[PDB]
Design an enzyme around this catalytic site. Structure first.
Site, PDB file in Angstrom:
ATOM      1  N   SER A 100     -63.060  16.403   9.008  1.00  0.00           N
ATOM      2  CA  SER A 100     -63.713  17.265   8.309  1.00  0.00           C
ATOM      3  C   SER A 100     -64.155  16.753   6.578  1.00  0.00           C
ATOM      4  O   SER A 100     -63.366  17.001   6.105  1.00  0.00           O
ATOM      5  CB  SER A 100     -63.485  18.112   8.432  1.00  0.00           C
ATOM      6  N   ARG A 101     -65.526  16.424   6.966  1.00  0.00           N
ATOM      7  CA  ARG A 101     -65.008  16.040   5.689  1.00  0.00           C
ATOM      8  C   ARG A 101     -66.103  16.399   4.324  1.00  0.00           C
ATOM      9  O   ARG A 101     -65.493  16.183   3.710  1.00  0.00           O
ATOM     10  CB  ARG A 101     -66.638  14.290   5.552  1.00  0.00           C
ATOM     11  N   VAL A 102     -66.592  17.657   4.836  1.00  0.00           N
ATOM     12  CA  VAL A 102     -67.541  18.555   4.607  1.00  0.00           C
ATOM     13  C   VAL A 102     -66.738  20.593   4.471  1.00  0.00           C
ATOM     14  O   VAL A 102     -67.260  20.944   3.595  1.00  0.00           O
ATOM     15  CB  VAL A 102     -68.792  18.764   4.050  1.00  0.00           C
TER      16      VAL A 102
END
Ligand SMILES: Nc1ncnc2c1ncn2[C@@H]1O[C@H](COP(=O)(O)OP(=O)(O)OP(=O)(O)O)[C@@H](O)[C@H]1O
Ligand SMILES: Nc1ncnc2c1ncn2[C@@H]1O[C@H](COP(=O)(O)OP(=O)(O)O)[C@@H](O)[C@H]1O
Ligand SMILES: [Mg+2]
Ligand SMILES: [Mg+2]
Lengths: 503, 456, 81, 187, 35, 470, 128
Positions: free
Chosen positions: G117-119
């Site tokens: 999950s990048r953000v």
């Protein structure tokens, strides 16, 4: 825009001929003549060009007819007159064709005169339905031990001979044709098998060598050869299998039994693909048309075993298919494998490993199975098949098997003996009783003490011995079709005494 | 409405109407032929011309030949009078036993049931077969993939499913021979006659046959599945039954759709399949479902091209399959019949929330012990010998004698209820029969028959 | 390339068969180095089977791509007429 | 049969039908009669009534064929142009009628020896100068040729005159001269 | 698929070739000395 | 005759419109107003009195409206004895700068194939002097041979060796057709033939006719040059009864030129980009190259295999048109073995014990069997190494390596490549040598002694000398 | 609607593989040039213009949001195929589900080495 919008047609309509039974070539190229008019012509109807060439109306379009030419393009020019013949394509049939070499239209190409047949048959009739048929029950004897024992064929089956190039497919077909001489010479009338060899896209030299080979074996007197060779028009190579099928359906309909070899269907599919691509029908996988499966399936469903209310005759089909590097997942191999009742698969490694015929028994299958066998061959071949499957399970352990338990070593030994037993020479089919005697010697264990290099010589010598001095037991097995217990004991005695005296 | 042929290119025929253009999917009747030729409308080309696909051969067709509009899609006789009969894609009898005298006819093209007609929780379809009902149960209104072809008793299992659903549930069956070999169709007809499933003398026939032969044009092979589905739809919607529908083969249904789409000039998709592959499969499969009247359960024989399960045809078929029955030859040569592979057969309703915790736990235990026994075979300790014994007994107890094999084998057929299966395998797993010999479980019904065979 | 993948599949299938036979032969000759050879050939066969599975996936993927590419070539040739 | 090709060639549906009618009329030497009858047909169909009637694709083909035969008989047309309109009506190429008429018209215009001459100039050019220009441009023609001159004004050529006699072409504008001198200075 | 390990020309096809040449170069030296 | 006009020029395809007298298909047309001769071959009748033609030379400088003249016949080349020692191109013009070829008769390069009754069933072995060919896949007198191989495996060297051996052993008017190959090689062959007396520039006792259409030619020329050479050979066979040798390098270029013009002739592509008519074109061309009852044509064809496929449609379609296919493997050429013939991929129709004898057949089959078993043993070598094999397995491997070496043979035409001198080995010498290596008569000799020698006596001599030095 | 009227919405597209297959059907029936796996050239735009509309708004635009959970089905675990890689290029991370885990009973069969999950890290609560 528009095939019939040529300036000559339009200016002739502006100025103000029978366009019903007659046409005019709008364009000709690559064997496809676009014909103006012919408003009464039927689909798949044979037409007539002004130079004498014949055609077939395949594309009926709103303003032109797509006609495939049964010959060369140079004899057809724009503006040539095309006539109707009013008939769908048909070939001559009857017993008058036995011993003749004809082309895809039933015209003699052997110079021995015109086929004096009285009956004609349409090449595109539909196969028998569900009810006219009966289950495939009678053996079609090929004379090849591997086929007759492990991949048995019945009268009415469709068995595919498939393999790469130069693996022995035509040889299997020709041994099968040569084998039927014992039955066609004798008096038992429902063991007789008439043969049709269809040569599709081959050399004329190859078909000449094949006809010579069949004449030397005296197999031509009951064989029809249909040849649409490589220099013939693609329509002729497309139509030759159906001509052969009608010639065999005559026999199938008149209470007799016929065998047909399509050698091969790959070249017929290629000819059809050319005809279709030039008619601009939408290409599919490998540029093949959408209805190439329909082509081969409606060809192959016409081989059938009939019930007793329809004469009891049969037509057995042996299509041939050449694969490229063993790729049975190509389009046409897939179609024809899907259509047929099993496949005799031939390998190149088996060929050069000394195993000839190079029949891969693991990949070969017959869905009719033991219903297409006699009770004697059934007895011996059940055991042979089980033992060879067991051998194939552990064949990878060979070249180390001397360091494995007695059960594995015995499986390996029995397997090598039976494998050496299934080898066979070309153009020499065996009677079913002789095959039964040899397989009996093999599976009952009278070869485990012998050396693998000596199995072929033992088999040849023992066969000569039993044919010379034991015609009684052979005749008994052949007449009863099964190995009776008295015949079993007699076989046991013969084989044990011979092996005692064998070197 | 009367039209006239303007083009004949293979199995594609263009028909021009001077009044009253027929909608798409309507059947047309070609006039002046000795056999019935039916054309199904595929496109409206403009200029009052429709493009059609033929259901039979098009040889002998003439441009200008009159064509009649039927006014509806292909209509087939539907009713109890179709049971035991054979009809082709356009509903006419192909068994030479006379006309099929039903009272009504149904169009083979129908929309799937609406959203509010759907059943909202999945129930099990009890077949009376122990291995199926236990390890990979069938759902009502579900699709089952039947893997394995010749030599594994596929026809015996088909006929036994027909017999068992007729006895246990009172629901008839329909068999659709999509791209059927005529030899194997004759064989199937006669095995069904000899096993009593088809009765040529009274009205006790349990199955209806619809045959689309291999030598028929691709349109007929693409619509025969719809014909069979229409017969089954009648039996579900008008008689509230739980119907069985067999589609043999489903890959041939996909193949015929691909061929028809190629004939119509459409650009092939990936691997050469029709661009409409998923929607063709969907419009067929969505009519196989449980409604509020009844249900249609579909057993479908799966062929996998090139053994590639990611091939578009299996990959599209597998999206609809609710279960899987794998008939293995390694199980048949082992002596077990039916030859269902108990470790490779799967089910989506093998879930505690669907079949219950007890069923799920018995099935899981059976599968775990069979996997353990495969592991132990691979190495041939203390209790591993007991695991081997219990797993051999479980293997034997998965077998079952079928009623459709009674005349040939002599053994009586057994229709084991679900509870008896669950509790029998539960007891074998707990150890309640660790004394009985392993051959007291071979070819028996409930576990009481196992103890009764152990007595002897 | 399809032919490279087929070459590699064939090679690794052969390696897997050979190591399986060697494992059986070491299992017979063991009835301390023989046990090590038996387990080592078992592990080699297991690794070869995993490489065979991954390469079979890659091969099916590549053959589907090749069929699609040839179809697209034929279609684009036909559409330009 | 052998077809008579017109002096100029037009292509497409319009080109083929115009070549057909030209050959069929030269077969009977009625070129001008059919020429003016085609002009009459073109003005007949272009009026919104017949245009909307025959360009309508859902009304049946045979109905508009009958109406066109009616309207071509009512106006006393030759059998040539009558069955020509009938042919355009059966093939459904009525939409291409104006194109067929235009192709035939340019065919007969070049058959009269009319060459399209264009004389571009920077400013509206003088009338006696333009008559002298006509007289000089008649020198580039064969006999039986007449100049159909239409001089449009392009002010960006800065002077001179750019003349196109059919496909012959002289670039006597001064902008060409300055561009050549600029290319010569830079190279 | 016989000889498909050497035909794939991998690290195993090179290992095989190196073995055949090493074993048969030693044999040829032992067969030429006697010869 | 009929006169038409060029209406379209797209590449090597030229459309011509005729007012009077449309020419039939396959006719040759002459383009008027050209300094060199440009011939157009009619391919299709397009309607509207237009034909579509393929140009036999370049189409640069052609104008729409340029006049074209109908010859009234297909391309007609000079045939006869006067063609011997000359080089002609696709349209029959001399390209050796030695003046016009003055023959008494011309023949059309498009003719029908011989009928079925004209075939001959006789099969007699043609001994070549090459060990692998003579032993495993022998050639037949009057049969079609065919040499398959990728790029750089030895098709040209092998065909020049066969030219050398057979064509000078022969006395019957060979023909060589260079189809779409390198011009340097054509010059080389011409000068080898002038030097070796086969072509006689003065005192015309030459015995080879040369036909050359090379890579730089447009596709029409490369598609018809094989038919021109075929036509010369056909004249020699039919209207003289002579026994002819026909050498074609390379026959794949005929198909490739067809495919190069296919799409511009308006044809939907087939598989692998080939024309839809690949098989029927190859068939109408190949069925004329045959022995009839009128005379014999022994045909040797080099067949290029693109990317070493052999399942490509062109070689795969050529395979069924031959009587003895010799397949050159790159894997064998990488072993240093030359010729690179694949012993497990080359087939002859006279490899029959009822034709060649049981000794020859048994020796060939034993060689192939030991080579197949060697192929299978190489796997176990790869996994286990050579020291863990049985002793009989080691014997199989040793004899198989010796048979591989002994299959190689030094060529006369390869001395510049090999250094070694050429050897021409008789048939019985070959059979005897391989029979002895199979029977185990040389398990004491090292394997390198059999490499690049002639008969088995040369093998024992080489072994002796290596023992002396090493 | 919710995203632009100050509220928060979550949308699941189940699944975008079948939507891409439907679009490929439509595109091939329009006779458009097929590309990789016979998909049209704009099959990336098809999903990109859609999944771009899932956004978090600043407070001058209401402060609402729209979260997107697109679903993609792979064939034999191949996540480097055309459509999977397109959607991986469009989205903010992925939750891989493996068959080898799902069969072993690890459910949800989330691969933790591959899911990301990048953000979402900035959104996790402090306790979690
Ligand atoms: N049982 C056999 N024993 C020995 N040789 C055999 C046997 N069968 C076939 N052959 C030989 O193997 C060669 C190839 O066999 P054949 O030509 O009949 O098969 P094919 O697949 O049809 O070949 P092609 O690719 O040319 O069509 C022939 O020379 C044949 O004589
Ligand atoms: N019989 C041979 N002996 C030695 N080297 C050879 C032999 N044949 C080929 N070669 C080598 O391989 C190269 C290719 O030769 P060539 O006959 O032109 O093959 P191809 O025509 O098939 O491309 C030669 O230049 C030579 O180096
Ligand atoms: Mg053959
Ligand atoms: Mg070369």
């Amino acid at each position: 825009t528009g095939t019939a919008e040529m300036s000559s047609i339009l200016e002739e309509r502006i100025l103000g001929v029978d366009l019903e039974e007659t046409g005019r070539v709008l364009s000709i190229g690559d064997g496809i003549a676009r014909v103006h008019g012919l408003r009464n012509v039927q689909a798949e109807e044979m037409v007539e060009f002004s130079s004498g060439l014949k055609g077939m109306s395949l594309n009926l379009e709103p303003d032109n007819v797509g006609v495939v030419v049964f010959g060369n393009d140079k004899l057809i020019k724009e503006g040539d007159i095309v006539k109707r013949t009013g008939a769908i394509v048909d070939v001559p049939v009857g017993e008058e064709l036995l011993g003749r070499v004809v082309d895809a239209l039933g015209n003699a190409i052997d110079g021995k005169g015109p086929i004096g047949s009285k009956t004609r048959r349409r090449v595109g009739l539909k196969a028998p339905g569900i009810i006219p048929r009966i289950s495939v029950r009678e053996p079609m004897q090929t004379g090849i031990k591997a086929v007759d024992s492990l991949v048995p064929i019945g009268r009415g089956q469709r068995e595919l001979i498939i393999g790469d190039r130069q693996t022995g497919k035509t040889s299997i077909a020709i041994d099968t044709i040569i084998n039927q001489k014992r039955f066609n010479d004798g008096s038992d009338e429902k063991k007789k098998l008439y043969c049709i060899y269809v040569a599709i896209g081959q050399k004329r030299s190859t078909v000449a060598q094949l006809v010579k080979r069949l004449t030397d074996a005296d197999a031509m007197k009951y064989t029809i050869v249909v040849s649409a060779t490589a220099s013939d028009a693609a329509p002729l190579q497309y139509l030759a299998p159906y001509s052969g099928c009608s010639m065999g359906e005559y026999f199938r309909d008149n209470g007799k039994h016929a065998l047909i070899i399509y050698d091969d269907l790959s070249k017929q599919a290629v000819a059809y693909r050319q005809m279709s691509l030039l008619l601009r029908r939408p290409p599919g996988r490998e540029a093949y048309p959408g209805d190439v499966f329909y082509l081969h399936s409606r060809l192959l469903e016409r081989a059938a075993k009939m019930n007793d209310a329809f004469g009891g005759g049969s037509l057995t089909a042996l299509p041939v298919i050449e694969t490229q590097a063993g790729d049975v997942s190509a389009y046409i191999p897939t179609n024809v494998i899907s259509i047929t009742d099993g496949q005799i698969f031939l390998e190149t490694e088996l060929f050069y490993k000394g195993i000839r015929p190079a029949i891969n028994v693991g990949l070969s299958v017959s869905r009719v199975g033991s219903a297409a066998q006699t009770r004697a061959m059934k007895q011996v071949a059940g055991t042979m098949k089980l033992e060879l499957a067991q051998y194939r399970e552990v064949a990878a352990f060979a070249q180390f098997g001397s360091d494995l338990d007695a059960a594995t070593q015995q499986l390996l030994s029995r397997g090598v003996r039976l494998t050496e037993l299934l080898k066979q020479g070309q153009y020499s089919p065996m009677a079913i009783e002789e095959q039964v005697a040899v397989i009996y010697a093999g599976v009952r264990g009278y070869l485990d003490k012998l050396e693998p290099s000596k199995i072929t010589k033992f088999e040849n010598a023992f066969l000569s011995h039993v044919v010379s001095q034991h015609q009684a037991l052979l005749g008994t097995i052949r007449a009863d079709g099964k190995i009776s217990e008295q015949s079993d004991a007699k076989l046991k005695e013969i084989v044990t005494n011979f092996l005692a005296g064998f070197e | 409405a009367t039209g006239r042929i303007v083009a004949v290119i293979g199995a594609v025929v263009d028909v021009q109407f001077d009044e009253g253009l027929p909608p798409i999917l309507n059947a047309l009747e070609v006039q002046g032929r000795e056999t019935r030729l039916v054309l199904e409308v595929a496109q409206h080309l403009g200029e009052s011309t429709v493009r059609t696909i033929a259901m039979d051969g098009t040889e002998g067709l003439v441009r200008g030949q009159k064509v009649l509009d039927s006014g509806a899609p292909i209509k087939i006789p539907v009713g109890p009078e179709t049971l035991g009969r054979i009809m082709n894609v356009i509903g006419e009898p192909i068994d030479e036993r006379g006309p099929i005298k039903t009272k009504q006819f149904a169009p083979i093209h129908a929309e799937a049931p609406e959203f509010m007609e759907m059943s909202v929780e999945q129930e099990i379809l009890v077949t009376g077969i122990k291995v199926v009902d236990l390890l990979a149960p069938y759902a009502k209104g579900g699709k089952i993939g039947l893997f394995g072809g010749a030599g594994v008793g596929k026809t015996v299992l088909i006929m036994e499913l027909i017999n068992n659903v007729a006895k246990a549930h009172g629901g008839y069956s329909v068999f659709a021979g999509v791209g059927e070999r005529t030899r194997e169709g004759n064989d199937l007809y006669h095995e069904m006659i000899e096993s009593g499933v088809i009765n040529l003398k009274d009205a006790t026939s349990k199955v209806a046959l619809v045959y689309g032969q291999m030598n028929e044009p691709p349109g007929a092979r693409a619509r025969v599945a719809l014909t069979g589905l229409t017969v089954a739809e009648y039996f579900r919607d008008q008689e509230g039954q739980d119907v069985l529908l067999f589609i043999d083969n489903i890959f041939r249904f996909t193949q015929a759709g691909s061929e028809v789409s190629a004939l119509l000039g459409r650009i092939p998709s990936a691997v050469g399949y029709q661009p409409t592959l998923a929607t063709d499969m969907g419009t067929m499969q969505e009519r196989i479902t449980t409604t509020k009247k009844g249900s249609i359960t579909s057993v479908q024989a799966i062929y996998v091209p090139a053994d590639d399960l990611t091939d578009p045809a299996p990959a599209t078929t597998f999206a609809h399959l609710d279960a899987t029955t794998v008939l293995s030859r390694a199980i048949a040569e082992l002596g077990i019949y039916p030859a269902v592979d108990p470790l490779d057969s799967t089910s989506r309703i093998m879930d505690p929330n669907i079949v219950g915790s007890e069923h799920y736990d018995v099935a899981r235990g059976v599968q775990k012990i069979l996997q353990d026994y495969k592991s132990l075979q691979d190495i041939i300790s203390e209790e591993d010998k007991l695991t081997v014994s219990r797993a051999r007994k479980i293997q034997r107890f998965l077998s079952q004698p079928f009623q459709v094999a009674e005349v040939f084998t002599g053994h009586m057929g057994k229709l084991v209820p679900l509870k008896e299966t669950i509790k029998g395998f539960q007891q074998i797993l707990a150890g309640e029969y660790d004394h009985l010999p392993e051959q007291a479980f071979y070819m028996v019904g409930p576990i009481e028959e196992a103890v009764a065979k152990a007595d002897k | 390339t399809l032919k490279d993948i087929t070459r590699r599949l064939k090679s690794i299938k052969n390696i897997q068969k050979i190591t399986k036979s060697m494992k059986m032969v070491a299992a017979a000759k063991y009835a301390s180095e023989q046990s090590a050879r038996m387990t080592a050939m078992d592990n080699a066969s297991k690794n070869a089977s995993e490489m065979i599975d991954k390469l079979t996936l890659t091969f099916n993927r590549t053959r589907q791509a090749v069929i699609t590419k040839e179809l697209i070539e034929i279609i684009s040739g036909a559409a330009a007429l | 049969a052998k077809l008579v090709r017109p002096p100029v060639q037009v292509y497409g549906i319009e080109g083929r039908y115009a070549t057909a009618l030209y050959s069929a009329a030269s077969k009977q030497n009625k070129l001008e009669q059919v020429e003016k009858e085609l002009l009459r047909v073109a003005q007949i169909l272009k009026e919104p009534k017949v245009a909307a009637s025959v360009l309508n694709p859902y009304v049946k083909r045979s109905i508009k064929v009958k109406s066109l035969n009616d309207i071509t008989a009512k106006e006393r047309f030759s059998p040539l142009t009558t069955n020509l309109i009938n042919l355009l009506a059966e093939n459904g190429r009525l939409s291409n009628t104006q194109g067929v008429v235009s192709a035939f018209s340019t065919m007969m215009s070049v058959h009269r020896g009319e060459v399209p001459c264009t004389v571009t100039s920077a400013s509206p050019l003088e009338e006696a100068t333009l008559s002298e220009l006509k007289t000089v441009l008649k020198s580039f023609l064969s006999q039986g040729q007449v100049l159909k001159l239409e001089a449009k004004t392009d002010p960006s050529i800065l002077g001179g005159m750019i003349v196109r006699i059919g496909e012959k072409y002289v670039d006597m504008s001064v902008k060409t001269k300055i561009q050549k001198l600029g290319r010569a200075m830079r190279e | 698929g016989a000889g498909s390990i050497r035909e794939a020309g991998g690290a195993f096809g090179k290992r095989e070739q190196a073995e055949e040449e090493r074993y048969f170069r030693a044999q040829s030296r032992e067969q030429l000395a006697a010869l």
